[model samples]
Target: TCPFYKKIPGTGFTVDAFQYGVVEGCTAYFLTHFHSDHYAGLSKHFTFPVYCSEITGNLLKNKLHVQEQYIHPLPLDTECIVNGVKVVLLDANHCPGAVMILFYLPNGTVILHTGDFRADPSMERSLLADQKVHMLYLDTTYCSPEYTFPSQQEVIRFAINTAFEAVTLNPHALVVCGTYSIGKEKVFLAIADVLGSKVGMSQEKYKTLQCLNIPEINSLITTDMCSSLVHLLPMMQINFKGLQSHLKKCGGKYNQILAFRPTGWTHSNKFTRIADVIPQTKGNISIYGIPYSEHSSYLEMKRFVQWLKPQKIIPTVNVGTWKSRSTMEKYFREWKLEAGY
Candidate 1:
């Protein structure tokens, strides 16, 4: 979880720090994304003006009921002046409406705050290409060496193939794609596309995705439970106990359950091969744990740190204590020195 008090010193700017509420010097509050971890402190009582991507702004208004006057939407890859400082939003690739913020201060300091991102080759061609970042507030969610996993495209393909095979073998099986509220849409969306099926979800989840305004996604959603063979459920429902209860709700509408819990923790050096990630089966319920993640891998983070070569790196995740922060600092120093900085 993101700490409740993360304010940028000397700038009067706070990013994802709503839990602490009404900081003495906070002039602007920036929301990196809509995940509860990032937007934990936000509520209808918010007084400060909030800045985020247009989709995120919509989510805030519709989901959180944040007043319109307080929401400011910034277009991606555009330079905008906020509180007398130049700010830029670049595609974060973590989730919809997520952006890596760039703050150009009056002192010529370039601060790159990567809210949460997956480093890819295309990011190198963006406005940040060859840019010098002075201080970096990085998303070090998967900072450890063992957190390395396959690319998102590969994992998505693996998920699609897995679902396709299961459905082909048993047409009556209920395919449940477990995911967080916002992230991991690609996996279930692609699976639905490949199978030419509508995705069933609760009304709340459907409303949340509607904020994205994607026509294809909008077309795949079906609020009616019996209308779709595949269902998009919360990650918490991927367990066998939950599956059993859900199956009972169907009332013999489906005989077997094929559950997919896609996350990064499932894939690692210990479970290198896809086959090694054995499917857990109990009677008619089978659960497959796919290594799908939005955060950058250890190798990806190293590549980014070496390429950007920021003067100072601030660890974002796993930094609640001095010991954890110091551990991440070791990796920062290693990457900086290896890049000849």
Candidate 2:
């Protein structure tokens, strides 16, 4: 309850769980974004009313085949009262249609569930103006000292630069970029648009781009590895075993295949090469793990927590919890210990 939700002060209700965290006894639901892991536990057969941004609701209806009736769209900046609490949606800046869920309770206790986001200036200007947050349900995926990632725009440029360098070296090589089903659409588009090439995607990813309906990008979707130099495959294709299978599926269609994996984890010591260049080669595949992640880094989160100064910081992962004051303070102490206090 501390992480996903808590009882609304002065009211006998609870804030709806944003993600998949046991929806059995929940009365209502709020969806912050449309990431696979965030909705991995929620199925299309679910009958609960889910309030989310219009694009996310559309994604749920078309991609996951959820009914349109249960998928409610909550517009940004507009205050809507649900179950005796005022709720406002703010931009989360994580993915395509992601949003932040701000619950303004009747008792003046405001709770913000930063779905999964990177802190931007707009958030600082509006949401962080004196900080109305009492409790924060944070996305602490990279809550460690090792993950000091660059900005998202910089990482995008790095990815495009890597692809550019790859194509420059080997003109005929089919650049297979492995990314999530969502979120990394811009990376593919940037590489394709700048190179004046079409983006090749699989069935699901192409459909996702189709639903987006951006005029400039819609005309550039090349289905599968057909007639496109850069083939956008799913994130699973970066592994050794998966790459082996993908090469087999191509059946010698392309003379060469250069791969790139843009994620935050590759910045760690475990990954041998950096994302800034066309580095790390194994066999014919030239792969680079770009540090293009959506979640905030350790230092970024450190600054956020320092400025936000919430009363309690809750971890949303399937980890242990500290509900009591004695134990919760211990959690904060340990959290700040890694990021320079």
Candidate 3:
């Protein structure tokens, strides 16, 4: 037994309880990613040693301000021993700081826990291929056939193309799109990679990225050091009126500006009204729809499971299990019975 705990329902002690529980005598926990769904419960309780990737560790410490005891930083694609258990960290490719945990037990059993992974061929070929995985715990968030999504590269290209078209339509106007600051780094990178030049970053964003130790983007520049290729403006500025007045005095050389913000702003009526206040010049404000998502699509999940050929597949998320249970049952019902589960 390892890391034993039980929660009774209808009590504060059982808050946020999931179907599974940690084993007793377990002296360590491996955090696969920094997403709230995965780490929120851990933050509520004290544990032994918590091991995570360097990027995830920094994000939790600097962004989330978690102060758990014995927070160990493990590098990607490296193996470490925790209480005699050998574990390896591999890039999950879902987010920048995401990772997959490979655990090797002393009994010669191996488990691969894929936490919110995507179907990134390069990452899979490099990290996962040829590895012997016994028990595979995968992300089945979109395991239903109804769930469909474009490929990551396709989404990135679509965003870039849409942005380019917007810029061409309004050569003198500034454009802004919405994206999560950290989660949308790929979108920004796509813009720069496709544009073949550097884009500006807001001071706040730069500082945030710096705190997370994000490397210098090959095609990103700070706002204060904008180049002729593109100007990355902040979503909101305190001296907006003064800045507009200043720009006006400069003969309106830059009549329009483009910026990107998170999608949360669109949910606010006030924000929509404020956006209407901006003059409708030749270039209009546009929100690109690229369909960039963090989770894998149904097809990708199916393919992954098919490839692994697990003896039994257990869906974790409540919604995933409920919706995909029937489909998975139809596909693997016979196999499950044969496995003697």
Against the true structure, whose lDDT is highest?
Answer: 1
| Cα TM-score of candidate 1 | 0.95
True-vs-predicted CA distance for residue 306, candidate 1, Å: 0.1
How do the residues 1-341 of candidate 3 rate in per-residue lDDT, one tens digit apiece? 11112221111122122223553333455676666656655542444466788877776666655674556788878678766667778877777678877777777767677777775556557556766666666676655555665555665665677557656777665434343345657666666656565655556655556555566653364554334334444434313453354345435555655444322112232233321322222232333334466776666666666566665454444333444567656645554454444
Score each candidate by Cα lDDT. 0.85, 0.70, 0.55
What TM-score should be assigned to candidate 2? 0.82
Ranking by TM-score: 1, 2, 3
Clashes of each: 0, 0, 20
Summing lDDT over every window of 10 consecutive residues in candidate 1, give the lowest-scoring window. 1-10
The candidate, 2 or 3, that scores higher on TM-score is 2
- Candidate 1, residues 225-263, lDDT tens digits: the string is 898888988889899999999999997889999888987
At residue 27, give the lDDT of candidate 3.
Answer: 46
Candidate 2 per-residue C-alpha lDDT over 71-160 given as tens digits, one digit per residue, 9 for 90 to 100: 888888777987677888888778888887788777788888787887765677764574468888776666666767677787777777
TM-score of 3: 0.68
Question: What's the lDDT for residue 36 in model 2?
Answer: 74
